[PDB]
UniProtKB/Swiss-Prot annotation:
<feature type="domain" description="Macro 1">
    <location>
        <begin position="1"/>
        <end position="167"/>
    </location>
</feature>
<protein>
    <recommendedName>
        <fullName>Papain-like protease nsp3</fullName>
    </recommendedName>
</protein>
<comment type="function">
    <text>Responsible for the cleavages located at the N-terminus of the replicase polyprotein. Participates together with nsp4 in the assembly of virally-induced cytoplasmic double-membrane vesicles necessary for viral replication. Antagonizes innate immune induction of type I interferon by blocking the phosphorylation, dimerization and subsequent nuclear translocation of host IRF3. Also prevents host NF-kappa-B signaling. In addition, PL-PRO possesses a deubiquitinating/deISGylating activity and processes both 'Lys-48'- and 'Lys-63'-linked polyubiquitin chains from cellular substrates.</text>
</comment>
<comment type="subunit">
    <text>May form homohexamers. Interacts with N protein.</text>
</comment>
Amino acid sequence: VNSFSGYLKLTDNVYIKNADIVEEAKKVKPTVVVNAANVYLKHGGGVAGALNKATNNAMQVESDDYIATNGPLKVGGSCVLSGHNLAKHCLHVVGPNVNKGEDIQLLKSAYENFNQHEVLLAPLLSAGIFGADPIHSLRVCVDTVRTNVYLAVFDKNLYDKLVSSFL
Ligand SMILES: O=C1NS(=O)(=O)c2ccccc21
């Protein structure tokens, strides 16, 4: 038994809710929150900008030190950093950005990072301002992630479409 409340069960291991991931993280304080990162860990907008704002920019300060030491992530890759006031850890995962021309086949590689963590609070990778079809992102998630994932979908309209179209 864990602390996640109000989720619809899609599969053995995947759950979904219409929720602001920031507000969900603040309430649950999960072991792992996933960020929809870019390779530079520049948390300007979308999920990343909202998570970073909720940390009072501490996420960005830590991220800048990480990049200065290690260089950029790979598209499809990840790193584990602090969760600050939101979670124990933040798993920064880079899904392909369709609005930059990145290979959508890299979405499966992105979701494979989640399998290194027993439980995660996450957004749909490559959705929103990353330009991918969220229905596709949910299918890749279900077909790739084997650990327990709690998906927060900000947009109520999209949430209802994801549930009602789920196979
Ligand atoms: O894919 C998406 N995640 S979201 O809920 O932020 C959203 C809002 C509007 C259009 C698309 C999308």
